[PDB]
Every structure is written in C-alpha cells, then in structure tokens.
Design a protein around this motif. Structure first.
Motif, PDB file in Angstrom:
ATOM      1  N   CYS A  63       0.763  -1.248   0.000  1.00  0.00           N
ATOM      2  CA  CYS A  63       0.000   0.000   0.000  1.00  0.00           C
ATOM      3  C   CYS A  63       0.802   1.311   0.000  1.00  0.00           C
ATOM      4  O   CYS A  63       0.216   2.385  -0.188  1.00  0.00           O
ATOM      5  CB  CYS A  63      -1.005   0.000   1.150  1.00  0.00           C
ATOM      6  SG  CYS A  63      -2.300  -1.214   0.911  1.00  0.00           S
ATOM      7  N   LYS A  64       2.117   1.242   0.210  1.00  0.00           N
ATOM      8  CA  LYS A  64       2.941   2.459   0.217  1.00  0.00           C
ATOM      9  C   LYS A  64       2.888   3.209  -1.113  1.00  0.00           C
ATOM     10  O   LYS A  64       2.800   2.601  -2.183  1.00  0.00           O
ATOM     11  CB  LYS A  64       4.392   2.144   0.572  1.00  0.00           C
ATOM     12  CG  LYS A  64       4.603   1.877   2.048  1.00  0.00           C
ATOM     13  CD  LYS A  64       6.051   1.579   2.374  1.00  0.00           C
ATOM     14  CE  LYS A  64       6.903   2.814   2.253  1.00  0.00           C
ATOM     15  NZ  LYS A  64       8.320   2.429   2.433  1.00  0.00           N
ATOM     16  N   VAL A  65       2.922   4.535  -1.038  1.00  0.00           N
ATOM     17  CA  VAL A  65       3.054   5.359  -2.231  1.00  0.00           C
ATOM     18  C   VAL A  65       4.452   5.100  -2.773  1.00  0.00           C
ATOM     19  O   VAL A  65       5.426   5.068  -2.015  1.00  0.00           O
ATOM     20  CB  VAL A  65       2.830   6.876  -1.925  1.00  0.00           C
ATOM     21  CG1 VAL A  65       3.143   7.744  -3.141  1.00  0.00           C
ATOM     22  CG2 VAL A  65       1.415   7.118  -1.465  1.00  0.00           C
ATOM     23  N   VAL A  71       7.229   8.469  -6.677  1.00  0.00           N
ATOM     24  CA  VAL A  71       6.206   9.486  -6.522  1.00  0.00           C
ATOM     25  C   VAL A  71       6.507  10.281  -5.273  1.00  0.00           C
ATOM     26  O   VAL A  71       6.668  11.489  -5.325  1.00  0.00           O
ATOM     27  CB  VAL A  71       4.815   8.883  -6.370  1.00  0.00           C
ATOM     28  CG1 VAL A  71       3.800  10.009  -6.222  1.00  0.00           C
ATOM     29  CG2 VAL A  71       4.492   8.033  -7.559  1.00  0.00           C
ATOM     30  N   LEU A  72       6.609   9.581  -4.149  1.00  0.00           N
ATOM     31  CA  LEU A  72       6.869  10.221  -2.863  1.00  0.00           C
ATOM     32  C   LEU A  72       7.950  11.303  -2.981  1.00  0.00           C
ATOM     33  O   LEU A  72       7.839  12.368  -2.391  1.00  0.00           O
ATOM     34  CB  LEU A  72       7.228   9.166  -1.811  1.00  0.00           C
ATOM     35  CG  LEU A  72       7.245   9.518  -0.321  1.00  0.00           C
ATOM     36  CD1 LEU A  72       5.960  10.220   0.093  1.00  0.00           C
ATOM     37  CD2 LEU A  72       7.489   8.269   0.527  1.00  0.00           C
ATOM     38  N   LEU A 106       6.356  14.273  -4.573  1.00  0.00           N
ATOM     39  CA  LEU A 106       5.388  14.877  -3.653  1.00  0.00           C
ATOM     40  C   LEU A 106       6.126  15.649  -2.575  1.00  0.00           C
ATOM     41  O   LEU A 106       5.754  16.786  -2.254  1.00  0.00           O
ATOM     42  CB  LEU A 106       4.457  13.820  -3.042  1.00  0.00           C
ATOM     43  CG  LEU A 106       3.469  13.166  -4.036  1.00  0.00           C
ATOM     44  CD1 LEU A 106       2.676  12.047  -3.393  1.00  0.00           C
ATOM     45  CD2 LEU A 106       2.518  14.186  -4.675  1.00  0.00           C
ATOM     46  N   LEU A 107       7.203  15.038  -2.072  1.00  0.00           N
ATOM     47  CA  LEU A 107       8.001  15.566  -0.959  1.00  0.00           C
ATOM     48  C   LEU A 107       9.120  16.526  -1.337  1.00  0.00           C
ATOM     49  O   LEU A 107       9.777  17.066  -0.446  1.00  0.00           O
ATOM     50  CB  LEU A 107       8.639  14.428  -0.153  1.00  0.00           C
ATOM     51  CG  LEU A 107       7.706  13.518   0.637  1.00  0.00           C
ATOM     52  CD1 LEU A 107       8.509  12.506   1.451  1.00  0.00           C
ATOM     53  CD2 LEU A 107       6.773  14.342   1.532  1.00  0.00           C
ATOM     54  N   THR A 113       8.270   7.167  12.380  1.00  0.00           N
ATOM     55  CA  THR A 113       6.853   6.834  12.470  1.00  0.00           C
ATOM     56  C   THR A 113       6.505   5.909  11.297  1.00  0.00           C
ATOM     57  O   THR A 113       7.132   5.979  10.244  1.00  0.00           O
ATOM     58  CB  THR A 113       5.939   8.111  12.480  1.00  0.00           C
ATOM     59  OG1 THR A 113       4.558   7.746  12.690  1.00  0.00           O
ATOM     60  CG2 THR A 113       6.079   8.893  11.175  1.00  0.00           C
ATOM     61  N   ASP A 114       5.525   5.034  11.498  1.00  0.00           N
ATOM     62  CA  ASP A 114       5.105   4.077  10.480  1.00  0.00           C
ATOM     63  C   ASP A 114       3.699   3.623  10.796  1.00  0.00           C
ATOM     64  O   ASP A 114       3.254   3.706  11.940  1.00  0.00           O
ATOM     65  CB  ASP A 114       6.015   2.841  10.463  1.00  0.00           C
ATOM     66  CG  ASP A 114       7.166   2.962   9.464  1.00  0.00           C
ATOM     67  OD1 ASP A 114       6.911   3.271   8.286  1.00  0.00           O
ATOM     68  OD2 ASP A 114       8.333   2.741   9.859  1.00  0.00           O
ATOM     69  N   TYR A 115       2.996   3.156   9.770  1.00  0.00           N
ATOM     70  CA  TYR A 115       1.730   2.477   9.971  1.00  0.00           C
ATOM     71  C   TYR A 115       1.431   1.527   8.822  1.00  0.00           C
ATOM     72  O   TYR A 115       1.838   1.750   7.678  1.00  0.00           O
ATOM     73  CB  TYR A 115       0.564   3.446  10.229  1.00  0.00           C
ATOM     74  CG  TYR A 115       0.085   4.262   9.048  1.00  0.00           C
ATOM     75  CD1 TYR A 115      -0.919   3.780   8.193  1.00  0.00           C
ATOM     76  CD2 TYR A 115       0.609   5.537   8.801  1.00  0.00           C
ATOM     77  CE1 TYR A 115      -1.367   4.548   7.120  1.00  0.00           C
ATOM     78  CE2 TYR A 115       0.164   6.307   7.730  1.00  0.00           C
ATOM     79  CZ  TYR A 115      -0.824   5.808   6.892  1.00  0.00           C
ATOM     80  OH  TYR A 115      -1.254   6.581   5.832  1.00  0.00           O
ATOM     81  N   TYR A 142      -1.583  -1.949   7.749  1.00  0.00           N
ATOM     82  CA  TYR A 142      -2.916  -2.500   7.958  1.00  0.00           C
ATOM     83  C   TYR A 142      -2.756  -3.985   8.322  1.00  0.00           C
ATOM     84  O   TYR A 142      -1.637  -4.508   8.291  1.00  0.00           O
ATOM     85  CB  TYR A 142      -3.751  -2.328   6.682  1.00  0.00           C
ATOM     86  CG  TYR A 142      -3.732  -0.909   6.139  1.00  0.00           C
ATOM     87  CD1 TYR A 142      -4.261   0.147   6.883  1.00  0.00           C
ATOM     88  CD2 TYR A 142      -3.196  -0.626   4.889  1.00  0.00           C
ATOM     89  CE1 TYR A 142      -4.258   1.451   6.394  1.00  0.00           C
ATOM     90  CE2 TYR A 142      -3.184   0.666   4.393  1.00  0.00           C
ATOM     91  CZ  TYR A 142      -3.717   1.698   5.152  1.00  0.00           C
ATOM     92  OH  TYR A 142      -3.704   2.979   4.668  1.00  0.00           O
ATOM     93  N   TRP A 159     -10.516   1.141   7.128  1.00  0.00           N
ATOM     94  CA  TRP A 159      -9.693  -0.014   7.493  1.00  0.00           C
ATOM     95  C   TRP A 159      -9.185   0.043   8.934  1.00  0.00           C
ATOM     96  O   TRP A 159      -9.261   1.080   9.591  1.00  0.00           O
ATOM     97  CB  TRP A 159      -8.478  -0.139   6.557  1.00  0.00           C
ATOM     98  CG  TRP A 159      -8.798  -0.320   5.093  1.00  0.00           C
ATOM     99  CD1 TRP A 159      -9.982  -0.741   4.553  1.00  0.00           C
ATOM    100  CD2 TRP A 159      -7.904  -0.114   3.988  1.00  0.00           C
ATOM    101  NE1 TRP A 159      -9.884  -0.793   3.186  1.00  0.00           N
ATOM    102  CE2 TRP A 159      -8.621  -0.411   2.811  1.00  0.00           C
ATOM    103  CE3 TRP A 159      -6.568   0.302   3.878  1.00  0.00           C
ATOM    104  CZ2 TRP A 159      -8.051  -0.308   1.540  1.00  0.00           C
ATOM    105  CZ3 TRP A 159      -5.999   0.407   2.611  1.00  0.00           C
ATOM    106  CH2 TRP A 159      -6.743   0.104   1.460  1.00  0.00           C
ATOM    107  N   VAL A 201      -6.043   0.412  11.046  1.00  0.00           N
ATOM    108  CA  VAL A 201      -4.780   1.080  10.795  1.00  0.00           C
ATOM    109  C   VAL A 201      -3.897   0.898  12.011  1.00  0.00           C
ATOM    110  O   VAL A 201      -4.372   1.017  13.146  1.00  0.00           O
ATOM    111  CB  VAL A 201      -5.011   2.566  10.531  1.00  0.00           C
ATOM    112  CG1 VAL A 201      -3.698   3.249  10.221  1.00  0.00           C
ATOM    113  CG2 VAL A 201      -6.011   2.731   9.383  1.00  0.00           C
TER     114      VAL A 201
END
Ligand SMILES: Nc1ncnc2c1ncn2[C@@H]1O[C@H](COP(=O)(O)CP(=O)(O)O)[C@@H](O)[C@H]1O
Ligand SMILES: Nc1ncnc2c1ncn2[C@@H]1O[C@H](COP(=O)(O)CP(=O)(O)O)[C@@H](O)[C@H]1O
Ligand SMILES: [K+]
Ligand SMILES: [K+]
Ligand SMILES: [Mg+2]
Ligand SMILES: [Mg+2]
Ligand SMILES: [Mg+2]
Ligand SMILES: [Mg+2]
Ligand SMILES: [Mg+2]
Ligand SMILES: [Mg+2]
Lengths: 355, 339
Positions: free
Chosen positions: B23-25, B29-30, B33-34, B63-65, B67, B146, B148
C-alpha cells in the motif's frame, strides 16, 4: 480561493469527497477509547492529556510529544495542509510549549483519487503543512505515506524541554476562570459548507442560513483552524496559567471534563457561555441531535486553548492576546471547589461571534 | 476466532485491501510529492537525526503504519510495534525513550468485534514495546474504512548511540538478518504449494515480523557496522538502493543471493508479476536489517546473532566501488529458509 478549474481538474472536484463527514466526527469516542487502552521528583505525564511528559536520563530534560491525524474538512488543499499541521501542534501549545524541535508528517493518499489529482492536490497540502511548520519555527524531517480509501492528514510534534518551558495542566484552584481562545462551531461550518453541493441537504437548513453566511463561517472556521496556538502558549507563562487543554475532536465539554479530572486540587469547572461562529448554533439547533453544538458535545478541529487563569490575570491575558495583530479570547466560565468534573450550565449564554 | 464469541468467518485481514505491491506510495512518486520539503539526518532514511542545543544530544525518531497482514490480532499488534521500532534499530539505536501508537478502528467492523479484537492488538503492541524496554504514553485512535496500525518511536541520543548510515567502503559485505517473502506468505495464506506449505510459511513470517531488530542494532556497534537500513515496504532492492544513495564514499551495492522463506520464491514465480520477489521490489513487513560490515567482522556478527533468542542472518552481497546505486545480480541464488 481554491478553484479545481485553476489546476486542470474537474470543476466537480471536492477534497472533502475523499472521506465521509459525520456531524459527531471520526474519533473513537472518549469512553470507548478509555476502555480499549486499559492495559497501557520530575513531573511525568502518561496517557490522558494532550502531551506525554517523559523525564529523560539526560540533564533534567523531559520529552514532550504528541500525535494526531484527521481527514479532509475543507476543499482548499493548501489550507487543509495548514490545518492538519496546526492541529498536530495545538497539543504542544496546550502545555505552554512554544517551541517544536521536530515534526513528522502522517499522510494518506486516497486510493480513489486519480494520479492527476494526487500530483496536483497533494503538493498544496504538503506546502500548507510545511508553511505552518515554518511559522511554528520547526520543520518536517520524516513521516509515512500510504494508500487509504481516505485522505489522512496528521503528524507528530516533539520537544525536548527544560522544566520551565512546559506548564503542567493541573494547578487550577477554586476562583480561577476559564479562557477559551477560539470560537466554537467548526464542524457545523465545514459540514454545512459541504451540504450546499447537495440539494436534499441544502433544502433543510436553506431556511436557517444564507449561502453567504455559510461561505462566511467557512472562511472563518478555516482561518481559525489554521491559526497556531503558539502565541496563546507563550502568554500562558506570562499570565501565570494554572492549567490548559485544547478543544479538538471531543468538543468543548469532552475536553473540559478531560482537563478537570487532571487537577491536583478538588476543583470542578462550570462553563457559563460559549463563543460560537455566528449562525452555527441556530444551524446545529436546526438539525436536532446531529451536532449538539449547544451541549458541548460537537467535535471541534484545531480549536483553541481552554485555560485556567488567575481571576486577576484573566483580563490582562485577553487584552494582550487580542491587541498585541491578535485574536480576541473569551472568559467562558469558572473553576469551583468541586469533584474534578466539568459542566456547561443548562441554558448557556451564546456569544454570537462575527468575522 | 470462534474463541471470542466472533464469527467463524471473522478475519482481521478483511479490514484492508491486499495488493501484491503493498500500500505504500511508490518511492518515485513520494520524492516528487516531498520535494517541496554534530551529524544531521533529514528526510530520506530510516530515522531523522536532529541535533539539539542540550548536551550534544540528538533527537532520533521515526513513524510508520500498516494494515492487517496476519489474522492473529495479538501478533498483528506485536508486528505493528516491532515495525515502528525497526527504524530506530536500522540506526543502531538499541534504546527507545518513548512510543506513541496510531490506531484506526474500521467502521466496517461491529462494536462487538472492535471490543474483542482491539484490546488484543493493543496488548501485542504493549508487549512488543516492553520487550524493547519502552512503553506507549500517547497516540491517536480514529475511525477509518480499514484497521490502521502504527505509532512512533523516539530516542534522545548521545552521539555514541547511533551509527550514521553513510560510512560504507569497497570490500564491505552486506548481511541480512531476516529472510524475505513476507508479502507472499501473507498474500497466499489469505487464499504449486500445499496448504501445509502455506500455513507453516505464514507461521514463520508472522514470528519473523514480530521479532525485534534490537539485538542486531546492538551488534552493529559490537562489530563496527558502517551503515544500515531495514527491509520493509519497498522490498530488498528498494531499500538497498535507498541505502546506497546515502553513501559518503563512491560505492555501489551488489546483491548475489536472496534468503527466502521456504517455497515463497516458488509462489512468486507463478503469480506472474504479482509479487516480483526475485526482482527485489516485493514489499516486506518488519523485515530484517541490511548491514554494511567490514569483511572481517561480518562472519562473527552472523555467528553471534545466531547464538548469543538466536536467529540466522545471511551474507547476501558485496560493497564495491561505484556511483551509489544498488542492484540484484541477474541470476540470484535463492536460499531456501525452512521453518
Ligand atoms: N508525509 C511525509 N512527510 C515527510 N517525510 C516523509 C513523509 N512520508 C515519508 N517520509 C520520509 O520519506 C522517506 C521514505 O519513507 P519510508 O520509505 O516510509 C521510510 P522507512 O521505509 O524507513 O519506513 C523517509 O525519510 C520518511 O521518513
Ligand atoms: N492508540 C492509542 N494508544 C495509546 N494512547 C492513546 C491512543 N489513542 C489515544 N491515546 C491517548 O489518549 C488520550 C486521549 O486521546 P485524544 O483525545 O486523541 C488526546 P488530544 O485530544 O489531546 O488529541 C491522549 O492522551 C492520547 O495521547
Ligand atoms: K495529542
Ligand atoms: K521511518
Ligand atoms: Mg489536545
Ligand atoms: Mg488526538
Ligand atoms: Mg489533539
Ligand atoms: Mg527503515
Ligand atoms: Mg515508513
Ligand atoms: Mg519503516
């Protein structure tokens, strides 16, 4: 001042499309929360307030930090970024902590949004987050970005403080007063703005408020939600604040109660009036038990600080914050000899607040 | 599940959507975006390293998350925690000063399921933290479509506590401390290979994902590691290339062998380009450390981590002169790591 058109998108684009709005908001409710979390010389603060305070092994320093995340609430991406960041920082400021040593960003990209939107919309949000962080005197140096059905916007704010840089939220005495530094009713304002794009819904309160009023409470909500509590945190030192919290997702009453239980003294709070963005009480009142803006139970997002001040420092604080350039604050209630609970009187006085 | 007055058909992993690519971008791309955003480490590695004014100290955090990925709520909370700390460990930081927890309670799950399941997840998270000598003193819990699962790890560090991940030189070797294939074990267990092949693989991966990288972090100091990252959502090549780009010297990473959970390479090959495991871009969850080690030290590190609670690690590649890139060799040897 955001036009989806001005960015090569469909006129129909809403950033608020990538989540579902609820009158009572998205946070797991307070009581449900407190139950799920049951297993989990230098003052420390663990679960229960706005910030942890974790004494460090090094030189009388304490780790002060906080995390939060929300979903899109306005259609202006840049401002939404500012708000997501200001909401994170709100909680440092509830502890009187004016500095942020570092931020992290929690980002969700909607799996429902096209690449074109994402590459167009996400940068505005990131710029917004960065700019607020810059006003805060800090920067975003890491984070996490994953696909989610909804746009998730949050972060972490951490400071390594000396003992006087933070104020423990527990020194209230009977005779202190309650100062609130931003007006209530943000949820009504953002939702009601979303309802105008929806006939059935707009028909209902159509009879309560004009499209002009709604646009006006929206720009105002958006403005105050992007407003940092940084100044308010600094003034808490100067005017000898005894305790503070911020008014975010559990509403003015939920957070008032949450502050009340933390007091070392046997005190309680009574809230006598509520500053509310104009026309929003009537709107909440018009929609039955949907918002409950009248009862103190409606979600705020990135609201203001609720502060226990000495009766005699209260007016100096308000004076100062409002006239430094600044934004007016209100004295909304009192602390009393009591049992560590909070209430709004049965018929609170509504101070209608205009832009 | 039936053990907690829950549906025989209750599945924790029902409350997300599985994508073989995770699911990571995407990394690429990141960066677009960043791109608007005492040693100092900013965006682009495992932790940030922010020098502070006090005592020569630095704020090291992450930090991380994720599912649900396993159907055991308790182990999923354990994995959720091991995953956030892994980044402190990549940096060789054995101590965690504080954690915050990120929780999303799915709106699709009943109050009854929420009330049984979440205390379990939280409980695993708590245990994982304690194993790491830390605890959870805050967080955020919100409704989401979902479940998380994340948090934050924070340490306030004396300079001695971390290893800047940029000190590799030619001749160093790359060791990997946990086998690969978690996305495949996890993907197919929700569904060439037998159900016993898939059950035992899922059981291994679940325990591997819950294992801390803490003893490896500590051993990075013992054996003078030169750099490290951890193998997570971007997979083996992805994280190796991000570590390579971090190198002070003109060096490149070459990966020769892949130690994979038994048969998961076989599953990957069949699913066409669903996983792409042997190509290097298959997502891991809470994977091991990839360490650049002086050639002399690497053997001892590996022997030592095998028996000090003991776990196998592999010498999977080499550090060579180059332009700060990484690659998997054309025909990489697949080491089959049995349970
Ligand atoms: N929204 C964000 N804002 C700022 N930094 C971010 C954001 N998302 C990711 N990052 C940073 O970008 C880099 C890549 O992200 P990840 O691949 O998640 C790092 P890891 O695999 O170690 O967890 C890291 O430096 C991470 O901290
Ligand atoms: N999943 C979690 N694990 C541990 N602590 C949590 C979790 N979720 C919320 N908390 C803590 O519970 C308290 C109440 O939650 P919130 O109302 O979100 C804090 P705030 O309103 O200041 O943002 C806070 O102290 C928060 O840090
Ligand atoms: K908080
Ligand atoms: K990280
Ligand atoms: Mg708060
Ligand atoms: Mg919160
Ligand atoms: Mg908050
Ligand atoms: Mg990492
Ligand atoms: Mg990450
Ligand atoms: Mg990670």
């Amino acid at each position: 001042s955001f036009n989806p058109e001005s960015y090569e998108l469909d006129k129909s684009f809403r950033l608020t499309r990538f989540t579902e709005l609820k009158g009572t908001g998205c946070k797991v409710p307070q009581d449900v929360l407190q139950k799920l979390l049951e297993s989990l010389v230098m003052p420390r603060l663990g679960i229960g307030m706005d910030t942890c305070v974790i004494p460090l092994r090094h030189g009388g320093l304490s780790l002060v930090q906080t995390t939060d995340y929300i979903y899109p609430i306005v259609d202006d991406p840049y401002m939404m970024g500012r708000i997501a960041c200001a909401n994170v920082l709100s909680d440092l400021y509830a502890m009187g902590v004016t500095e942020c040593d570092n931020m992290l960003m929690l980002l969700g990209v909607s799996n429902k949004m096209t690449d074109r939107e994402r590459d167009k919309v996400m940068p505005l949000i990131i710029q917004g987050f960065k700019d607020a962080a810059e006003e805060a005197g800090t920067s975003v140096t890491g984070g996490q970005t994953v696909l989610n059905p909804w746009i998730v916007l949050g972060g972490v704010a951490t400071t390594v403080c000396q003992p006087n840089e933070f104020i423990m939220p527990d020194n209230a005495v009977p005779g202190d007063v309650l100062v609130l530094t931003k007006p209530l009713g943000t949820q009504v304002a953002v939702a009601v703005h979303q309802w105008l794009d929806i006939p059935e819904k707009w028909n209902k309160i159509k009879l309560v408020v004009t499209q002009e009023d709604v646009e006006l409470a929206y720009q105002e909500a958006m403005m105050n939600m992007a407003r940092l509590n940084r100044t308010a945190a600094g003034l808490m030192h100067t005017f000898n604040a005894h305790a503070a919290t911020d008014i975010t997702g559990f509403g003015i009453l939920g957070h008032a109660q949450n502050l009340a239980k933390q007091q070392r003294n046997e005190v309680s709070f009574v809230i006598h009036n509520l500053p509310v963005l104009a026309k929003m009480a009537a709107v909440s009142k018009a929609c039955g038990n949907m918002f409950g803006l009248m009862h103190g139970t409606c979600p705020e997002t990135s609201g203001g600080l609720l502060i226990c001040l000495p009766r005699e420092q209260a007016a100096r604080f308000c004076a100062e914050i409002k006239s430094p350039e600044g934004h007016q604050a209100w004295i909304i209630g009192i602390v009393e000899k009591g049992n560590r609970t909070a209430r709004i009187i049965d018929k609170p006085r509504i101070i209608e607040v205009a832009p």
